Structure 1
Amino acid sequence: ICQDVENLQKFVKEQKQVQEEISRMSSKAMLKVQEDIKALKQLLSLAANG
């Protein structure tokens, strides 16, 4: 049994690491995009009006 808790907390925690891992990983790259396509669309309107 107390082999036991040595492992389970270990597999659980191993998992929290991945949770951290995702947490480390987070977006600005994404936020960037809408701004750009919103911007490119506008230049296209230029060229078109030109």
Structure 2
Amino acid sequence: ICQDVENLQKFVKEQKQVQEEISRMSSKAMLKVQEDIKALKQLLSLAANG
């Protein structure tokens, strides 16, 4: 049994690591995009009006 808790907390925690891992990983790259396509669309309107 107390082999036991040595492992389970270990597999659980191993998992929290991945949770951290995702947490480390987070977006600005994404936020960037809408701004750009919103911007490119506008230049296209230029060229078109030109």
1:49 Cα deviation from its structure 2 partner: 0.0
**Alignment length (residue pairs):** 50
1:6 Cα deviation from its structure 2 partner: 0.0
Give TM-score scaled by structure 2 length: 1.00
Identity %: 100
What value does the CA root-mean-square deviation take over the aligned residues?
Answer: 0.0
Q: After TM superposition, where is structure 1 displaced by more than 2 Å over at least 4 residues in a row? A: none
Q: Could you tell me how far apart the structure 2 residues matched to 1:33 and 1:10 are?
A: 40
Structure 2 residues not aligned, in runs of 5+: none
Give TM-score scaled by structure 1 length: 1.00
Structure 1 residues not aligned, in runs of 5+: none
